[PDB]
Amino acid sequence: QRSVARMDGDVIIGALFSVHHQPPAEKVPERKCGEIREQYGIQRVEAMFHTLDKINADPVLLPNITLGSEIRDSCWHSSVALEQSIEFIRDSLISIRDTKKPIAGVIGPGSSSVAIQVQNLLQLFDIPQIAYSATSIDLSDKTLYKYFLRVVPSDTLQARAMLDIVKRYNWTYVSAVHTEGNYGESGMDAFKELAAQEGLCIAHSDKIYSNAGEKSFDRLLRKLRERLPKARVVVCFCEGMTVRGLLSAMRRLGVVGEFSLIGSDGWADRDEVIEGYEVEANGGITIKLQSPEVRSFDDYFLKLRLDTNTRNPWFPEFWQHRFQCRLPGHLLENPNFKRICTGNESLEENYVQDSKMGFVINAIYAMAHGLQNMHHALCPGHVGLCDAMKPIDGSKLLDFLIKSSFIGVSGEEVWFDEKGDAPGRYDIMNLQYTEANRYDYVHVGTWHEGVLNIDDYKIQMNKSGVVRSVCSEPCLKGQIKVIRKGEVSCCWICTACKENEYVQDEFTCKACDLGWWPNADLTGCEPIPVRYLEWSNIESIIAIAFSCLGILVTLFVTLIFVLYRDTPVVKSSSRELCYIILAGIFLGYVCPFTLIAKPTTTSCYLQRLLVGLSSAMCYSALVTKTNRIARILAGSKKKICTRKPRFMSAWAQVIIASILISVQLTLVVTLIIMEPPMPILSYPSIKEVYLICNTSNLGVVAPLGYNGLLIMSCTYYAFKTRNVPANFNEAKYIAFTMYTTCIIWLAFVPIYFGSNYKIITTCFAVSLSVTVALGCMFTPKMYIII
Amino acid sequence: QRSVARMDGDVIIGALFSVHHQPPAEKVPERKCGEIREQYGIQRVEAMFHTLDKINADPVLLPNITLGSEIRDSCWHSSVALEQSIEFIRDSLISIRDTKKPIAGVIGPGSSSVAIQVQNLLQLFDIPQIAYSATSIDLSDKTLYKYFLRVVPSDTLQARAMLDIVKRYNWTYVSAVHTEGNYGESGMDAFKELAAQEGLCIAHSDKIYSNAGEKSFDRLLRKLRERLPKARVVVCFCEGMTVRGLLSAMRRLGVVGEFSLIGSDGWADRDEVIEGYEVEANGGITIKLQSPEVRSFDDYFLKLRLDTNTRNPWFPEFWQHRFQCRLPGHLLENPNFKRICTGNESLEENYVQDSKMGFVINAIYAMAHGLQNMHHALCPGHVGLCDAMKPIDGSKLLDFLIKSSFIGVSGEEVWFDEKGDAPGRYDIMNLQYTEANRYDYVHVGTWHEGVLNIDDYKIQMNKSGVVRSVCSEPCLKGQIKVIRKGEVSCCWICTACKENEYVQDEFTCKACDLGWWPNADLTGCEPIPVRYLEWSNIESIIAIAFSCLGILVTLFVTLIFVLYRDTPVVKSSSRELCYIILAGIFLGYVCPFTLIAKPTTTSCYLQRLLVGLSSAMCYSALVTKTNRIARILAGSKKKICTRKPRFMSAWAQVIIASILISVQLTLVVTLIIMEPPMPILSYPSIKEVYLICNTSNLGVVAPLGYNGLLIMSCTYYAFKTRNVPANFNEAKYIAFTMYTTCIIWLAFVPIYFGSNYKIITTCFAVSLSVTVALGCMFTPKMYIII
């Protein structure tokens, strides 16, 4: 029959405490348990034999309520744990109906994959189990799993601690590995999710099984050992044997000093992971739990003796297994042990206090303050249990646990949040050889509930500031866009934007509107070309000087004409003729100085009054003279025509020649009232702002084409003028004047259309055509009359 | 200390037949049970014993293997079955370590909630549950629920049968109702999904609670009044108490017979729920399980005695329950009756066999066949349990049960598919009037495995009855636009297709192409017939008559001209210049003949010769006859010019006139090499395609640009030549003919723009312009000369 340890009291509490090992792999149909464990077995059974003797006599935690124990071996195998679970349940359910008291809770199964399989049983009877080691994620969901809370932190905390280490050195693109099953998968899924909220891009997602072939660790090496300049921090949510395989693979192909792996809880400080491969792992971070060794136990356990401990069955087999000595004094002595011994042995022989024995005594105390919250809220002012508490429940008792907090045995508090997750107080251990060849795990600070406080004076002392997650650098210089490289996020590509493009997004610039292109580093679109036209260009200063020289030659002609009326030719020919051509030429010569200007609304009126009225009134003045002689030439002696449409005075003929002047003034007024004189900003390029007045091709072909047909009217009535015995050869120079104006008049338009700054072409073309007309007409008729 | 009925054997089978009632006695913690149900308790305990006493005695099913049994009570409670199950899973454990023997399976607990909470206790020991009543939807998840067969239909099968009724009468919009809690939610979500993929639309799902106010049941009917003419039928997925409330509120308002209700499995043979509300219930279909009456049990059970059945506790104490008697002769007698029992009593006292007595004896035989697989396939050619198979296994039992099948007690086959679901074989009922005041259920066909088998001549007794509850009528008529009525596809609102719209899809009428009206039956777009006429219409008979009379009158003016050479003007002047009038206008009068024609590349080209070159030749006539005297004007004494542009002969003046004929031809011939005449389908409307050959405003004014200069040149040299005494004032005749023809030839083009039938305008106008030239030159020529 399987034996049990039992401590008396009133409110007895059950426990599992994996005494024996796992039964043999094939003997599970009869499920006969293996050998004693003596780190988890007989160190923990004595936890519930001396801590339950502290609480016994403690007058502040259970005053005058005697607490009790039961310990039923689980043999690390879910079948034996389940057979033993029905015994607590049986005696509880027979007791509540009718030597057998109800068990109030369970001090936790050893692993996590027996915590699910014993909670699915205990959930049905309303009895909370309180785990001390069950670090698996899916035991957190309070929809399936109510009766399960822990004094050991969950796997979302390890995932977050690994994110905090990685993101505290600006690492943001990492390879990932994890062992197959629930552990590595769950932890990597948690971490990979938390990574995806801060722009981390896991360079290589991976899976591998622990006893998979040497080819599987070897191909894993090839895979991860590609992209070496891009990512060197491999996050390993791994077990010790998977990492021992990856270090053994890295020994074989000899790529020892390449990349800096960071571990998980699987390989805290234990040396089975590293032994024989000490050179591959130097400068390798882990995280481990902080379970402080309890000094209050080493006193008790190491003063124990075989002969004076009758409350622990499994203890005589523990002595025989520890000391190689069959003791035939008491029964159940193994045959393989010779050299019969005494009870005067040192329990000190390679004694090591358990890692997870701070957790058993945090766990029992969490279960012994649910019986203080209950004993005062439901039994106010009583010594011993009152009636309503006496046949103890679990539904109210679980709430009196989930709101319990305390101080532990190591100064740190035990307290449960809303889903039974204990506080994450995690250490960090870098591994490095400090003295001669001795590779050890050195403590370098702690994670502490999101407060990472890693000590950089002890962290590495390896190579300099280790090449980051550097696949595509932070290349965001002046003018730069981040190309993103569709497929991947982190490896974006470093590329400049065009000149016109402004940095709207750091990921994409936009070519801002015409009128604008941005400043240095493409930040803000400023009113770029304020380029001036008003006064002159320095090249247009010769055209300004030629307009001035024009005004000089009109004043030279006035110096011989107006105040010197002493000439027979101007006495016999009408004077008003010569007054209207000098007024025409004067208007066409003040014009070029008013042309070069920054066009405004009123300055556009000036500029169209310039081209329209100056050219038309200049040539209307010239044709008043040529019309007066044309009327003679066509109506006197050479063109035989019947009609005489003329008046009986020379002044009336000068007035008839003046009728045509005003018609071009009516044309330009009807063209101005239609489309107004307004300045327009011109953008033929990104750096060009000529700001030209409204002066369409309609306004430069209509009045100028009407002066062109007026030169054709002169040419028809200036045919035989070449050889006529008229006034002092003047008539042949009238024909030459019309030829020299009409040739450049026709040559103007093609060069005008093709050229850009064609306004200087208009001023120089109008100025040259009028000065050759002035010169040809006047310079013989002023020089021969001396 | 609840009791157990047991019988001896070699392979024992457990069951949880609900002996007592669900005790609300105080609460759970006392655990005291109610009364022996006798329609669910003791009635099926002797059914298990009868079923086993047919199997211990036939050599076909378990020869030399003896079955045993363990009948225990569940007291119809979630927390009494859970205590009792522990004595089957503390026989398997103790009988395999260490009389007591292994129990192989648990035959069904009745209530479905017990069948979830006692199968999260039988996974852990690998023991098949075989349910006989557990109609839950989610007891088919083979991830959470694995050791769980059931010989009763799933609720997705019933939800399919519900849909199949509504799909056979061709209904497509219906209001839903379901009782809150697992039953109604499950089966309504199943039906809503099945509806959604099929193309139904559930009108309003006012799902309600069972024990709400009569004003909440009023609020159901207050909503039902919306869409009362449109989507009137309810699918009541409820227990009978919600139906009782829904007919209480129907009687309240007096909205008696507007819609029928198609009831679910909760209301099919519930008559108790319709006692007093029969007037609201007529015409309502239902659906029930098909569980046949078993005769073999009824004969055995009704012949039983209180002194013979020693294998059944509860049965020496059920006699007082059924018969209202009390005997001092039996121990543990109830006090509340005081008429003394006898041993010899009738047991047929309103005996009705259970609805599930054909489901117990089907379930046990599913086991006895699944062990006739195990005893064959592990112990071949053996008698009794062999070396292996003892203690009997878990996961090999379950893999021989899942492929067990053999005919039941009632001719129907038990057989499991891969999820422990039995076959869907459903009856139907309906409340109807059979005789004088007789609302009762009548069977009206069956639903078997998705085949529905109603016969209408026993259902509803009404031809039209419930109208097609569709959210719009079947709006598909001849060529109707569908807006789809986006709230639901199938219930689209009909709208009228536009004059240009067509159905590419029925569900979207959309516009056709321009000039291509939407063809008959809206199957696309269709082009229409063209307005052109090659052969003569009545409107062309006038035009060809004008063309041909035009030719004949030219033959008459030649009869008075070329045959009669006694003309004063001609035979002094050239005869060919008076003849080239007729030669030129020949083609001008032929314009109407081949203008009003078909567009073909040669005939529509000939029509471009009509618009261009023929019109050029008909004005080549006019320019020869008027520009001869015009050029002679410029060269004679009557008007003088600067040169001598004429030779010494009239034959030189003929080829000089032919220069003006040549440039008039050449102007329009420069365009014929650029545009070859292509027939353009220029559509002036959607109801006309019209087909004008290659024509534009440029195409018709192509000769007009030189006609204007020819007429103006000949007008300037004929302006006052009218007043000059010609041969008989014929210069004034010519001046009047040009004056009348010119102004109407300008006034052509506003009529060409206003009126669209340009072909009639050009032919009619050219006929009007050429007739006056003959009527006012050639007729006075003839009349003066004769």
Author numbering:
A (entry chain A), B (entry chain B): 35 to 132, 152 to 839
Task: Show passages lifted from the paper.
To enhance the expression and stability of mGlu1, the wild-type mGlu1 was modified by N- and C-terminal truncations and the optimized construct was expressed in the insect cell system. To seek the mGlu1 active conformation, the orthosteric agonist L-Quisqualic acid together with PAM Ro 67-4853 were added during protein purification. Eventually, we obtained the cryo-EM structure of the full-length mGlu1 homodimer at a global resolution of 3.96 Å. Although an excess amount of agonist and PAM were added during mGlu1 purification, in the cryo-EM structure, there is no electron density either for L-Quisqualic acid in the ligand binding pocket of VFTs, or for PAM Ro 67-4853 in 7TM domains, indicating that mGlu1 is in the ligand free form. In our full-length mGlu1 structure, residue Cys140 lies in the disordered region of VFTs and the disulfide bond is invisible, while the dimer interface is also formed by the B and C helices in VFTs. In addition, the distance between two lobe 2s is quite far. Therefore, the connected CRD and 7TM are also relatively far from each other. In the apo state of mGlu1, the distance between the Cα atoms of Val523-Val523 and Asn235-Asn235 from the two lobe 2s of VFTs are 60 Å and 30 Å, respectively.
